[PDB]
Design a protein around this ligand. Structure first.
Ligand code: JVA
Ligand code: MG
Length: 449
C-alpha cells in the first residue's frame, strides 16, 4: 500500500481492521471537520455489528475538533442525507458496508445540503490528512446530541403521494435483514397497503445472506413471497436501503432501466415541464417516456455525484439511473429507496394497471441486455477490439460515459467502472430481441478475445 486502500472514488470502503478501524475513523472525523463549512455534523449507521463503534470514533474525532455531532442512530443512508439537509448541517457521514463481506465496513460522506464528498471533491484531501496525522487524539470540546425523531423524514416521504388516492394494495417487503423494515413499519400506520414482510428484522449477522436483491438466490425469496401471497408487487432493498428493487405480480424482477422512465412519468404528472436526468448506459426508453410526459430529458454521466450536480445545475425534479438509484430534487437532490416504491404504489392505485402492465410494452419496445461485466486482461485493448470491429457500420459515437455507439436499430454503452476494475456492457434495440442477442454475444466474444 502506498495510499490508504479504503479511500475509493465515492466513499470509504475497507476490511476491518487493517483497512478501516476506530483509529482511522477518529482521524477521519478530525480531517472532516477541517473540510466542512461551519456547523454540526450528522452521523448515522447501518445494521453491521461494527458500525456503531466506527460511528462513535467518528464522533470523538469530530468533537475533539470542536464540531457538534447530531447522532441520528441506526438509519438508512438516505436519512443521513435528509437530516444533513433538513437540519442545515455542515455535513454528514453514514457508516455503511453496503454489501461488502462481513469483515468489511465503510462510510459515505456529505457536506452542506448533502452534497457528495468524493475523491476529487474532498475525499482524497481527507485521505491525505488522515495519512499524515500522527497527532495525539485531542479531547472533546463539543457535544453530541441524539436525535432519533424521524417525523420530518417520514412526513417528507409521504408528501410525494396523495394518500387519499392510495388503494389497499398487497405489497411484499423484503429488507434482507437490512434497515428498510424499520422505515416500512413507521410508514404503515399512514398507508392502506397490506404488507407481507420477508427477512424483515434487522440482523447484522445476516442469517439469510448479505442484502443484495440482484443475486438470483436473494431475488427469488421476494419473487416467491409475491407469487405465494398474490401480492400486487414486491420491493426489496439493499442493507442501507438507498437502493430498491421491484417485482411485479408474476414474481418477475423488473430491470432497473424501466423504472427510470416509469418514475419519471409518475413525477412529471405532478411537476409538468420538468427536467429529468438519466445516465448514458440505457437511454432510448427514458428519453421517450420523459418526452411523452411533457418532460425534458437531460443526459448525464453515470455516477451519483455527476447525476446530483447535473440535477442541481438544471433544476431537474428527478434523476434516475438504471442501477437502482433514484434522486429527487425535493429530497436534497439525494437518492432514496423509499420514495420510488411510494410513487409506484400511487401509480398502480390511480391507474388501475398492474406494475407488470405499466412496464410490459416498454420492455418489448426497448429490450436491453442488462448490465454485463467483464474482467479482462487489458480493458483498453478490449474496447479497441470492439470499436475496430464495428467501425465499418459508421455508428454515431458519444463519449459522455465511456463509449456510446448508436447504430440506428441498436446501441450499446461500454464503460470502465469507477468503483471496480471492470468493463460494463449495456445493449438495447428498437423492439428486436433477436438483434439484441446476436449483438450482445458478438460484443462479448470481442471483449473476451
Ligand atoms: O461501478 P460504477 O458503474 O462505476 C458505480 C456504481 O456506484 C455508483 C454510486 O453509488 C452509482 O451512482 C452507479 O450508477 C453505479 F451503480
Ligand atoms: Mg446502498
Amino acid at each position: 500500500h502506498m495510499t490508504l486502500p479504503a479511500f475509493k472514488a465515492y466513499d470509504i470502503r475497507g476490511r476491518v481492521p487493517d483497512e478501516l478501524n476506530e483509529d482511522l475513523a477518529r482521524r477521519i472525523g478530525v480531517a472532516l471537520a477541517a473540510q466542512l463549512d461551519q456547523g454540526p455534523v450528522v452521523l448515522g449507521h447501518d445494521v453491521r455489528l461494527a458500525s456503531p463503534a466506527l460511528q462513535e470514533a467518528l464522533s470523538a474525532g469530530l468533537r475533539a475538533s470542536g464540531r457538534d455531532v447530531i447522532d441520528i442512530g441506526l438509519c438508512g443512508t438516505e436519512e443521513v442525507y435528509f437530516q444533513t439537509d433538513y437540519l442545515k448541517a455542515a455535513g454528514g457521514v453514514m457508516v455503511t458496508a453496503s454489501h461488502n463481506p462481513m469483515d468489511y465496513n465503510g462510510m459515505k460522506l456529505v457536506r452542506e445540503q448533502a452534497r457528495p464528498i468524493s475523491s476529487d471533491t474532498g475525499l482524497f484531501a481527507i485521505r491525505d490528512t488522515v495519512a499524515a496525522d500522527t497527532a495525539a487524539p485531542g479531547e472533546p470540546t463539543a457535544s453530541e446530541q441524539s436525535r432519533t425523531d424521524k417525523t420530518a423524514y417520514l412526513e417528507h416521504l409521504l408528501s410525494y403521494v396523495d394518500r387519499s388516492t392510495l388503494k389497499p394494495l398487497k405489497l411484499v417487503v423484503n429488507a434482507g435483514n437490512g434497515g428498510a423494515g424499520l422505515i416500512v413499519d413507521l410508514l404503515a400506520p399512514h398507508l392502506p397497503f397490506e404488507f407481507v414482510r420477508v427477512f424483515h428484522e434487522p440482523d447484522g449477522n445476516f442469517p439469510n445472506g448479505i442484502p443484495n436483491p440482484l443475486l438470483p438466490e436473494n431475488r427469488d425469496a421476494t419473487a416467491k413471497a409475491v407469487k405465494d401471497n398474490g401480492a400486487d408487487f414486491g420491493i426489496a432493498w439493499d442493507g442501507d436501503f438507498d437502493r430498491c428493487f421491484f417485482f411485479d405480480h408474476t414474481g418477475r424482477f423488473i430491470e432497473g432501466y424501466y423504472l427510470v422512465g416509469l418514475l419519471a412519468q409518475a413525477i412529471l404528472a405532478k411537476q409538468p415541464g420538468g427536467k429529468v436526468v438519466h445516465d448514458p448506459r440505457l437511454t432510448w426508453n427514458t428519453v421517450e417516456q420523459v418526452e411523452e410526459a411533457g418532460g425534458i430529458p437531460v443526459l448525464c454521466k453515470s455516477g451519483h455525484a455527476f447525476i446530483k450536480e447535473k440535477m442541481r445545475s438544471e433544476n431537474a425534479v428527478y434523476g434516475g439511473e438504471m442501477s437502482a438509484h433514484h434522486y429527487f430534487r425535493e429530497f436534497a437532490y439525494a437518492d432514496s429507496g423509499m420514495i420510488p416504491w411510494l410513487l409506484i404504489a400511487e401509480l398502480v392505485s390511480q391507474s388501475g394497471r398492474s406494475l407488470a402492465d405499466l412496464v410490459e410494452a416498454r420492455m418489448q419496445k426497448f429490450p436491453c441486455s442488462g448490465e454485463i461485466n467483464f474482467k479482462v486482461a487489458d480493458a483498453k485493448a478490449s474496447v479497441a477490439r470492439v470499436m475496430e470491429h464495428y467501425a465499418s457500420l459508421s455508428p454515431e459515437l458519444d463519449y459522455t460515459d465511456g463509449i456510446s455507439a448508436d447504430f440506428g436499430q441498436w446501441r450499446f454503452n461500454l464503460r470502465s467502472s469507477n468503483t471496480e476494475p471492470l468493463l460494463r456492457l449495456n445493449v438495447e434495440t428498437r423492439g428486436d430481441a433477436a438483434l439484441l442477442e446476436t449483438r450482445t454475444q458478438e460484443i462479448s466474444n470481442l471483449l473476451r478475445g
